[PDB]
């Protein structure tokens, strides 16, 4: 019941920024968190950031802590990954999934159709 958007995604150049959003239908269930995750190919995927819908509180995967930012717009039921000095290892569909817990993957039951990021040599 939950429809999921993201936008944002493309080509850009390695040391540089890029910010994705999600749009959301609905509120996440069973658990309130909302999170971006990431698959490359040949790989498991990923959890990147998290956060309560609650209360706000944010999670990150240590592959991209202190370069990314996760953040919402209550009014807009959006939230958005800002996502800094990026390097062509962060190169990935990036998903906005809700209604989880942090970033296990296997508790969201609703998932975008993923934006892809591509990040140059
Ligand atoms: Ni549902």
């Known amino acids: 019941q939950v429809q999921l958007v993201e936008s944002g995604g493309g080509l850009v150049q390695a040391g540089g920024s890029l910010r994705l959003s999600c749009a959301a239908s609905?509120?996440?269930?069973?658990?309130?968190?909302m999170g971006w995750f990431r698959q490359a190919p040949g790989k498991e995927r990923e959890g990147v950031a998290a956060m309560d819908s609650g209360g706000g509180g944010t999670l990150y995967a240590d592959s991209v802590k202190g370069r990314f930012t996760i953040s919402r717009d209550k009014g807009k039921n959006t939230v958005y990954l800002q996502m800094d000095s990026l390097k062509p290892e962060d190169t990935a569909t990036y998903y906005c999934?809700?209604?989880?817990?942090?970033?296990?993957?296997?508790?969201?039951?609703?998932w975008g159709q993923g934006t892809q990021v591509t990040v140059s040599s």
């Open positions: 999934a809700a209604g989880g817990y942090e970033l296990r993957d296997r508790t969201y039951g609703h």
């Open positions: 609905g509120y996440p269930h069973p658990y309130l968190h």
